[PDB]
């Protein structure tokens, strides 16, 4: 029943940003977890999270190789890692996010 949200961002091009997003989405599907992924690429923000989705989310994952503004996530449990972790170990990020051992931002 869990709901996650994520942001992915890499300052170089777009492929890494998207690959992290795709791989988090597939990991979520595999794990039977709901997820929405907002991307923050050079081109702008796409698939933007809403205020309501953020209120309901169990946790937030940020897989980014640049600083991402986290002000929307005050009071939310947040996991912050590199874009490579989003691409390479998305299941482990989703598991860690839902195991709950993550600080409240």
Our answer to whether residue 28 is catalytic in this structure is no
Contacts of 69 (CB under 8 A, 6+ apart): none
Please give the Cα distance from 48 to 93 (Å, whole number): 20
Q: Is 88 helix (H, G, I), strand (E, B) or coil?
A: helix
- Burial pattern 7-27, b for ≥16 Cβ within 10 A else e, equals bbbbeeeeebbbbbbebbeeb
Q: E strands of 1-105, at which residues? A: 3-9, 34-41, 44-46, 59-64, 78-81
Q: Which of the following is catalytic: 5, 10, 20, 83? A: 10
Q: What is the resolution of this structure in A?
A: 1.8
- Tokens (6 digits) for 94: 């989703």
> How far is residue 62 CA from its own chain's centroid?
4
- Tokens (6 digits) for 77: 């449990």
Q: Is 65 helix (H, G, I), strand (E, B) or coil?
A: coil
Q: Which of 75, 86, 79 is nearest to 51 (CA)?
A: 75
DSSP 103: -
* Number of separate domains in the chain: 1
DSSP 57: -
Q: Residue 33's domain is classified under what CATH number?
A: 3.40.50.2300
Q: Domain residues for 16?
A: 1-105
Q: Which of 52, 58, 43, 74 is nearest to 6 (CA)?
A: 58
């Amino acid at each position: 029943n869990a709901k996650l949200l994520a942001i992915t961002s890499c300052p170089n091009g777009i492929a890494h940003t998207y690959m992290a997003a795709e791989n988090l989405q597939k990991a979520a599907d595999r794990l039977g977890v709901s997820i929405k992924v907002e991307t923050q690429g050079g081109i702008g923000v796409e698939n933007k999270l809403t205020e309501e989705e953020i209120r309901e989310a169990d946790a937030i994952i940020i897989a980014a190789d640049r600083s991402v503004n986290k002000d929307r996530f005050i009071g939310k449990k947040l996991l912050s890692v590199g874009v490579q972790d989003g691409i390479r170990k998305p299941e482990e990020l989703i598991q860690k996010a839902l195991n709950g051992d993550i600080p409240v931002y």
